[PDB]
Amino acid sequence: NLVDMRDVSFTRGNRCIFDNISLTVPRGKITAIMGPSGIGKTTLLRLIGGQIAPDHGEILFDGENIPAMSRSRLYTVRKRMSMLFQSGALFTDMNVFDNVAYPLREHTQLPAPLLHSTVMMKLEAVGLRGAAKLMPSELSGGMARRAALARAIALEPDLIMFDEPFVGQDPITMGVLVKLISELNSALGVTCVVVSHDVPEVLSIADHAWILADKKIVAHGSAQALQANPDPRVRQFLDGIADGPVPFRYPAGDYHADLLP
Amino acid sequence: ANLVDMRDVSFTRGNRCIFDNISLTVPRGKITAIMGPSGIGKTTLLRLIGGQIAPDHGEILFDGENIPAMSRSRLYTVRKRMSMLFQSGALFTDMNVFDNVAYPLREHTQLPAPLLHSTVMMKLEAVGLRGAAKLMPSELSGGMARRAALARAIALEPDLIMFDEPFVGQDPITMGVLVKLISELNSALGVTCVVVSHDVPEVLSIADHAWILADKKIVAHGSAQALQANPDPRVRQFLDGIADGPVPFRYPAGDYHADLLP
Amino acid sequence: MLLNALASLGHKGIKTLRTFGRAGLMLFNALVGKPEFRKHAPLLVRQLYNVGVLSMLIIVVSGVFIGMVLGLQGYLVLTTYSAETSLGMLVALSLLRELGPVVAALLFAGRAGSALTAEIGLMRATEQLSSMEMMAVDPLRRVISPRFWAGVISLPLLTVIFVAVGIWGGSLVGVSWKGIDSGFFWSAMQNAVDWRMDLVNCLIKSVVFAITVTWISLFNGYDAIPTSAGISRATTRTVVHSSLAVLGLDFVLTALMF
Amino acid sequence: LLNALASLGHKGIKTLRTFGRAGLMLFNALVGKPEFRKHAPLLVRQLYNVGVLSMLIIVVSGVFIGMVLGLQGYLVLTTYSAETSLGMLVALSLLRELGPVVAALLFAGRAGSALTAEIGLMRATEQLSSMEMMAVDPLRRVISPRFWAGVISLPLLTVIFVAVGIWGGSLVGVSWKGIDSGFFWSAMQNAVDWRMDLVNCLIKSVVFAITVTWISLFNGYDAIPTSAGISRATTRTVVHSSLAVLGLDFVLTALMFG
Amino acid sequence: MSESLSWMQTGDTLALSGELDQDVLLPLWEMREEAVKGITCIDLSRVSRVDTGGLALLLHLIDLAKKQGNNVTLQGVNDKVYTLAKLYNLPADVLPRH
Amino acid sequence: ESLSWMQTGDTLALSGELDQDVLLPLWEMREEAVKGITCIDLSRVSRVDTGGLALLLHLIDLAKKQGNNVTLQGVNDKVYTLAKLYNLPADVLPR
């Protein structure tokens, strides 16, 4: 089945973000909703969790509706999403060991000798077991997203939403974050919705792809079917060039009044 | 000939070390790409060439003349021939894009107001930001902020433009613009460009001599085509996007039998 | 002009009305609900350090500077009639009516008022409030509720430290320096002050000023835009709106009680 | 002895180089080549966000402090026949201690926090580092017009705070409670004198303008270029200026007023 | 409800039935002193979902048995246990593969 | 280094180097050189930057007001390699 929205239309006070988009991914399959910068890629994952209410549309999640349930029903569905963010979403007043155990200290009923053994093996999967006593201010940009990935798998979720991972990192730790999703899906099994813009780093493990252009879904498919697709808007994003639908220049006058008046 | 040649400097910042012994020569009229992992002093490497900071050991020269061993008035005379740009797109907030590009050549040169209006529109047309000259820099995006700083960098006709990690987090539409902008300004103007970004498959198509900066040393000095056939574990792990290698990713600290099951 | 001036003034009238509507809904959704006295008990003492303990340095060393200035200015104009039995009145009476809860509130809005705005605004830019509501209880009753109750306790408590030091600070320019027979300084200063006029009435102004300062300090950090310039813009508006709420309510409480 | 008990370190070497960094920041921004025509549009542009924009929190707050000075100056002079000396308390308080001290706390809150946020955002976006590269000094470009703007604004904003606060006492003293205008202004015009109330109000307004502007321009220059260093230096600007205005208020009153 | 354990003790056989969730571990956490008293046979055959919560108590029943010198093994364990051992990098002498 | 023009009335023989600091004797004294020439000579120049290109296009546009067709002869390679970079259209710089 599908766990994302069906047909929504998000519109702000001045500009528009989405206009009759559709998302469909099977359970346990990694999808990749790609798109250029400037558009609302961050606010796309907020409609699934229920942070903001859309104007016209509905989000189907296992036969339910996100903007139609109450406040007590929204907290039950939110216990199995654990949306990962772009920057480091770690609390500065606590260390790494208390950040991962923070969903475990208010939802689970595990005792103190049992909770110490659960966090210590969750950090071993992301490779941050020795940095459990360090501060989040001492961590770098690559280790901050890996510490939030262990916090995301604390309550055993069913739909992990990655909000622009490895956006400005070196290719040494960029391949680690790609490899961390492959071990969290082939060994456990979880649907991953990853939004990004880089082509050759997300079309390796994801089985489905989505292209958003001009506030609409222009194409879809797989990692191999998206290469052989004749389209002026699709072939500009993949294998990025200067020409295409982007006119490469700002809309100006006659080039005779500003220059040489 | 060469321009800088990067004599042996250390720049020990009290607690931690930045460079041990580096040799990053810059040939004239080429594209010197210095790629490396994050967390090291890649931003402060360009500050040693411009003369904003002084190293501890050794020296650094620029076109024959030494940078730390010179007067303050002579350092400001040779610093206008570089005109480097930054990652965040450093533009002035109080003025728009038109007086941003017209800022360095107003107080230095003596061009009149009709000749100044016919000069900013030349540089804004090469980057594609002519119609946005009457627009604020705050409402601009992250991609067009780097193109407005590139037109400001070519105002005083420099000789060594230092790109402080461009297109680090941009969309591939904008990433295809800034690659073509260096290829059309290096052949026409004849200005040396230095890129210190870590995007490996993007800057290697335009560079003429790549440089790998890892573990505060120079482990590779090959070209853009000879870098793919370098039998070294510290170079092969940085390229091609792999996870494991000489760099530890598991963070080995403490015994696993002590933390688990206490 | 009629369709342009009314539209520009009408646009700012709704945005002003929507500003108070978001501040009322933020305080109402942070005080009522289920009782969590066992969970907020380690969270209240943690927020009592950066509000009450860290703001004690700006009050103690400035408390001896208020009384030394007020004790020196209030002496040379009282020597024309009687040097003895002076400086007990006009110093302790002034530090319990106008000075005191007003002067400590400008030090609370500058030190603790600007820090609580920059703390919530930094967590909004780093996506900490949105990440807490996506997995657990929403941060309206988790990080805002212990920060609101910490301001209505510390500022009534820090005003008593500002009064007792400033009274002793006024007893340093009168005793052991141009002395005024300090046996006459006591047993007549106590006859001027009394309960429900100077002692309890000082505590009335401290609770009222603690609410109107911490409300704007927790709303500007919550309504700021998640960027580097929006936190610095909301930090400037916290000191502005609290100075007009302390000096503005100073005329309200003086004409009502005194 | 070698550990943190006695020779703890990082307190004699540290926080003393910052005094040397603040001394070199002002000496290299004020001593140089005379550029009068170059800094002439920069002084007018930096006078709007320093002197003009800070005039809003002084006019509406001058009548707030000016009215409570007349409310508290009435009931304390009932049994002393000092009803004709109603301007004796309002004018003398707002020209000696109130005035240049209270306006300096509003200058450090609005203009002091904005000057720290302005230079701090320039270093975070590397605007000062890019300005330094194009053959010009960033010290005598943005710091030097901001220093001379803040120096000449605070005595020009104190006289507005005095005249509004005196008129604020006239609306509560002459209009209300029935005091004669001939008896009110006779206690102000030919009662207080020159060189004690008028010159000394302008002497301490200049020294308070130098100390606040030097602190606000140093915390914005010596800061960490990140999102948390600007908010930390904005908080430290109000703390360091409130202890310097109130700290020098006891120092400056040693010569004048007896 | 499906969240239950219902452990049965036949002297030297511990057949952990039901479902190893994160909330039914409390009856077995207080009664763990009798499940290491000379067993040498840990059976997990009637389980269907063994997450990281139930795997933490599964390592506790082996480590407390090693203090008394036991030889506990895994008899017919589910395939979801072994695929989580390679993810969390479990070492030897704490969870036997055979 | 100087920008002394050998204007005899039909050639406008511009000599020297076109830099961003020697345009002052030619910009102010420009009304007495577009008096029906239909010719601009650029054979004795080698460094034509974007500052000197703005003064070059000013001499052609003032010739179009009086009806003069400018034919550039002996031009350097630096002028043509900057017209395609700055996207110079037709009828302002004859190729």
Ligand SMILES: CCCCCCCC/C=C\CCCCCCCC(=O)O[C@H](COC(=O)CCCCCCC/C=C/CCCCCCCC)COP(=O)(O)OCCN
């Ligand atoms: C013998 C009985 C005398 C009267 C006893 C009762 C007096 C009660 C007064 C206290 C209650 C009213 C308080 C009003 C507010 C006072 C505050 C004040 O005066 O300003 C102080 C400082 O004091 C001054 O401003 C100096 C005042 C100088 C007064 C000069 C003499 C005034 C003459 C009035 C009496 C007339 C004398 C002539 C004889 C006739 C009457 C006997 C502020 O200090 P800062 O450090 O600047 O605060 C910074 C943070 N806001």
